């Protein structure tokens, strides 16, 4: 494994998808999606998945803050693999309390230039998301032979915001309604690759946290 040169066909198919890759990343990256308002980004991904025949479902605690889960169904008898990236981004309409420069173009937009794609929302995390969205599209369209399912999981509320004191509920929740919620309500698989910007370096330990008032 993997395959024979079933691989070669898929690699060429991906070569031919370079424009889709850039387009998806720019469009996704251009959507305003600070934690608390990921809905519009979610909708984009849902429709993208629907268009491409991945039978997406919105899986969320709130109707405007939800995870999106689709699948490329395998033929049977293989391990399933989830691809996962998050829908929310860092800087809200105005985080003047955190950052002194809470409004630069790079902080709230995304665009294709040279052979680059600019924008914090691309780095974190619409770019890696576009990557496996395209990967799945290629696998599907190349007719790749897969015994196991590929599960496509775009999650809300990855960023470390949390309710506390008088700041409660819908507007301030994050991780509790994101990935763990999506998995607990059906987005399960044998393995999961979380796509984030790591410069092609794999990690498989992470920290926990305790917040103290």
């Amino acid at each position: 494994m993997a395959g024979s040169n079933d691989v070669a066909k898929v690699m060429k198919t991906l070569d031919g998808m370079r424009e889709g890759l850039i387009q998806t990343a720019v469009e996704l990256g251009s959507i305003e999606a600070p934690t608390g308002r990921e809905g519009a980004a979610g909708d984009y991904v849902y429709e993208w998945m629907a268009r491409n025949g991945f039978g997406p479902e919105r899986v969320g605690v709130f109707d405007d803050r939800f995870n999106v889960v689709g699948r490329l169904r395998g033929t049977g008898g293989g391990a399933s693999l989830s691809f996962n990236s998050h829908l929310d981004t860092i800087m809200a309409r105005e985080d003047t309390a955190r950052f002194a420069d809470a409004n630069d173009r790079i902080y709230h937009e995304a665009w294709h230039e040279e052979g680059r794609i600019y924008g914090y929302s691309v780095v974190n995390c619409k770019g890696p998301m576009a990557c496996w969205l395209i990967a799945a599209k290629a696998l599907k369209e190349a007719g790749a032979a897969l015994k196991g399912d590929v599960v496509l999981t775009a999650v809300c509320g990855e960023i470390d915001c949390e309710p506390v004191d008088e700041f409660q509920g819908h507007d301030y929740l994050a991780e509790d309604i994101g990935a763990r919620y999506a998995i607990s309500h059906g987005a399960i698989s044998d393995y999961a690759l979380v796509a984030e910007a790591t410069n092609f370096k794999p990690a498989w330990v992470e920290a926990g946290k305790v917040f103290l008032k």
Partner: protein, 212 residues
């Protein structure tokens, strides 16, 4: 007073160890500034103490509030942090002089801060108070039995609505029963209250029968 620092980092990337005044975390810098301003405040009230006919003003300073970052997003420390200072002025002190003094405390620490006034009101010594002062004195000696004592400094060094009256050319003094809430006291003797009402009524019967 808003101290600047930064750049902000996601907690797993925060640079340590850093000296407090050099902390990229504005909160940590503000902590040093708070201490220097407390030192400044101790001396400020001494330096600007001033005796008037109407009382001795001991103008005090307190830090009444602080905020930096927001509680519901604490994964990246803030690049700015603000305190809100209550600085009393004797009647002869320009607010700008005080602003400069605070700016100097900041500068000596080598910090960058914005020092912004968001409130200024003047204090006043009454002028031409004598006819009310006298009517009151006579009433007080009669009802209470002894001459009036000069007020403690705190009660001469606060906000009271004598300021707007005096500002507008209406000589005005403050007087009543009980120790002061800011102190703070928690009850009145009914007896004292009655002495106050009688002092007030007598003051009026004197003063309002004098020709203006």
């Amino acid at each position: 007073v808003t101290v600047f620092a930064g750049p902000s980092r996601y907690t797993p990337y925060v640079p340590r160890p850093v000296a407090a005044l050099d902390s990229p975390n504005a909160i940590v810098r503000m902590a040093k500034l708070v201490e220097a301003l407390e030192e400044w405040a101790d001396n400020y009230e001494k330096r600007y103490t001033r005796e008037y006919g109407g009382g001795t003003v001991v103008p005090k300073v307190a830090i009444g509030a602080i905020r930096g970052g927001v509680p519901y997003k604490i994964y990246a420390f803030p690049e700015l942090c603000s305190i809100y200072m209550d600085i009393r002025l004797n009647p002869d002190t320009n607010p700008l002089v005080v602003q400069r003094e605070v700016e100097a405390v900041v500068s000596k620490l080598g910090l960058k801060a914005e020092v912004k006034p968001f409130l200024f009101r003047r204090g006043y010594e009454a002028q031409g108070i004598e006819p009310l002062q006298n009517a009151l004195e006579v009433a007080h000696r009669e009802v209470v039995g002894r001459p009036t004592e000069r007020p403690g400094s705190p009660e001469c060094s606060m906000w009271r609505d004598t300021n707007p009256y005096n500002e507008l050319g209406i000589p005005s003094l403050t007087y009543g029963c009980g120790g002061g809430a800011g102190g703070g006291n928690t009850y009145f003797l009914v007896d004292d209250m009655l002495k106050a009402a009688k002092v007030y009524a007598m003051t009026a019967m004197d003063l309002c029968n004098r020709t203006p």
